[PDB]
Each structure stands twice: as structure tokens, then as C-alpha cells.
Design a protein around this ligand. Structure first.
Ligand SMILES: O=C(O)CNC(=O)c1nc2cc(Cl)c(Cl)cc2[nH]1
Ligand SMILES: O=C(O)CNC(=O)c1nc2cc(Cl)c(Cl)cc2[nH]1
Ligand SMILES: [Fe+2]
Length: 190
């Protein structure tokens, strides 16, 4: 229930850590339906080059396109969490969000050099990779939260939702992927 997830977990977590992970966000059935939609997009060659900086291929999805209705459901689900966060007494307001950025790292040692997404703004990432073994497949998101002496390594696990502040508080990189690695990102801003 968004009301509870936002107010009891996401807000305090974002306040304390600036990074929040929610596993099993939508469940396996819905998650694999999104997986199947992303693969269909990928199989038709609709992804364009995300660019020495990044090896990903991407497409932007509004959520109402034929074949994209479950991706639209994911977006509505993220929207509701953000709405409950920004509706808290004393909170700043979000005025917009991007379309869904569907991204594929097509193995072959592709990754993303360390960067800052927006050098407020929140990055929301939903991962789609079932039984991902990072030891063999790579693709770890390494994040450097401000204030911590350690970095955090986040596996791009199926049905995992990740929030983090998009600004210089959270530089991050995608370590090289050696298997096809899928994710969907939405940025919430202003
Ligand atoms: O809870 C407090 O004492 C301050 N924090 C906030 O107002 C707050 N507003 C927020 C809005 C968004 Cl969209 C997100 Cl992800 C976290 C937030 N945290
Ligand atoms: O896939 C992950 O686990 C992380 N991905 C990224 O950091 C990432 N950051 C990005 C920033 C921009 Cl501006 C664009 Cl277009 C794609 C990105 N992809
Ligand atoms: Fe990024």
C-alpha cells in the first residue's frame, strides 16, 4: 500500500540515506509481464545508442503505447509512491517526471562510467533481471552516497525498485555487464 510504503519506509530512508531499495515491488507475474514487454521492444531494434562513456541502448516509453501497458502500470505505481512522499506535510513538490527510460546493456562488457545524473530530483530504477549472478554477469550499480566512508553495490535484481537523489550526493557507475541487462528509469523533478 503506497500510503504505508511511502510514509513508513521511503521518506525516512531517503531522509537518512538518500538511497532506498524496495525488493519484490510488483510481484513475479507483473514483473515478468514488464520483462516480456521490454524484450519485445528490444527484439524489434527500437533501442538507440545511449551515447567511451556508456554502452547502453535505450528507448523512451510514455506508458500508453500498444504493447507497453504493463510498463505504464509500473509508471503509475512509481507515480503513486512519489505523490505520497511529496504530499507529506512540509515536503517540497515534484512538478514533473520523465517518460520511462527503458535501458539494455547488451552484455559484451558494456557499462556506464561514474557520473551524477543531475549535476529536488529523484532517480527511480526498476530492475528486470531474474536469477542474475553478478559474479559471472557483472552489471552491479556502484553508488557513492554522500557522508558514507563505503560505497554500496546494488545488484540489478528482478522486481527491485531503487530510489536515490539524482544530484551530486550520489555519484554512481554501472560495472561492465556480460549478460543482457535490463532496467527502467524514471526521473522525478522540479
Ligand atoms: O520527512 C521529512 O522530515 C522531510 N522529507 C520530505 O519532506 C520529503 N519529501 C520527499 C519527496 C519525495 Cl518525491 C521523496 Cl522520494 C522523498 C521525500 N522526503
Ligand atoms: O542501470 C543502472 O543501474 C544505472 N543507470 C544509470 O546510472 C544511468 N544514468 C543515466 C543518466 C542519463 Cl542522463 C541517462 Cl539518458 C541514462 C542513464 N542511466
Ligand atoms: Fe545514472
Amino acid at each position: 500500500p503506497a500510503l504505508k510504503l511511502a510514509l513508513e519506509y521511503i521518506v525516512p530512508c531517503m531522509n537518512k540515506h538518500g538511497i532506498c531499495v524496495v525488493d519484490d515491488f510488483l510481484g513475479k507475474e507483473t514483473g515478468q509481464q514488464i520483462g516480456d514487454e521490454v524484450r519485445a521492444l528490444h527484439d524489434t531494434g527500437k533501442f538507440t545508442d545511449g551515447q567511451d562513456i556508456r554502452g547502453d541502448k535505450i528507448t523512451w516509453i510514455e506508458g500508453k503505447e500498444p504493447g507497453c501497458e504493463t510498463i505504464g502500470l509500473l509508471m503509475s505505481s512509481m507515480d503513486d509512491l512519489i505523490r505520497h512522499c511529496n504530499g507529506k506535510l512540509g515536503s517540497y513538490k515534484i512538478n514533473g517526471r520523465t517518460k520511462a527510460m527503458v535501458a539494455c546493456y547488451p552484455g559484451n562488457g558494456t557499462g556506464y562510467v561514474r557520473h551524477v545524473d543531475n549535476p529536488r530530483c529523484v532517480t527511480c530504477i526498476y530492475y528486470l533481471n531474474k536469477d542474475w549472478d553478478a559474479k559471472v554477469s557483472g552489471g552491479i550499480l556502484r553508488i557513492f552516497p554522500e557522508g558514507k566512508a563505503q560505497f554500496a553495490d546494488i545488484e540489478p535484481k528482478f522486481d527491485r525498485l531503487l530510489f536515490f537523489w539524482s544530484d551530486r550526493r550520489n555519484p554512481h557507475e554501472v560495472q561492465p555487464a556480460y549478460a543482457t541487462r535490463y532496467a527502467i528509469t524514471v526521473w522525478y523533478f522540479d
